[PDB]
Amino acid sequence: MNIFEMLRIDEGLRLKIYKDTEGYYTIGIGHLLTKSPSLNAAKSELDKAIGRNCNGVITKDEAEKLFNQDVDAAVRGILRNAKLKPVYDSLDAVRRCAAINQVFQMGETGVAGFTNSLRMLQQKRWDEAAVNLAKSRWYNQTPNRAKRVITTFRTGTWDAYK
Numbered sequence: 707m708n709i710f711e712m713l714r715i716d717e718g719l720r721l722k723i724y725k726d727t728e729g730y731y732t733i734g735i736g737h738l739l740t741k742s743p744s745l746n747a748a749k750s751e752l753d754k755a756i757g758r759n760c761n762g763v764i765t766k767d768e769a770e771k772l773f774n775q776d777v778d779a780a781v782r783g784i785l786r787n788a789k790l791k792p793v794y795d796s797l798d799a800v801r802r803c804a805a806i807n808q809v810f811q812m813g814e815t816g817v818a819g820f821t822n823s824l825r826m827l828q829q830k831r832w833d834e835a836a837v838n839l840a841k842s843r844w845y846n847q848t849p850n851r852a853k854r855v856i857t858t859f860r861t862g863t864w865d866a867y868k
């Protein structure tokens with residue numbers, strides 16, 4: 707297991723434009739296209755991202771290319787964030803994957819506001835952090851995925867990803 711395999715499990719792979727859990731146009735391995743309700747706007751974003759006229763469909767290679775860009779950008783963002791970086795750097799590699807996963811799903815701003823969870827994680831108070839992480843819209847809206855990510859934070863193992 708690694709961050710790519712983990713997010714591939716949590717996000718799936720779809721080659722045609724679909725709506726994510728929040729109802730937003732998305733493609734590939736959880737690549738958000740736009741929050742606009744206009745499918746044409748999503749198609750425009752897709753074509754811009756891939757560099758050709760896709761008419762709403764991409765290849766597996768293209769999906770994987772976006773995925774690599776998205777994972778890379780998620781990490782680089784964490785490292786640029788004054789609140790997230792010290793916590794991320796305090797973690798072991800497995801828990802770092804859980805951090806990347808959450809930012810990939812939620813975006814960096816939302817996570818940066820998890821002030822109490824962040825403090826507990828930096829303190830390595832793992833059970834307490836796990837309890838705090840679940841007191842969230844995140845957990846309530848996507849509980850099965852959040853449970854996997856939280857178990858990863860709690861244990862520093864890949865047990866939740868079989």
Ligand SMILES: N#CCNc1ccccc1
Nearest residue numbers: 790793794805820823824
């Ligand atoms: N809070 C929380 C868990 N997620 C996270 C995300 C980025 C850095 C450190 C932790």
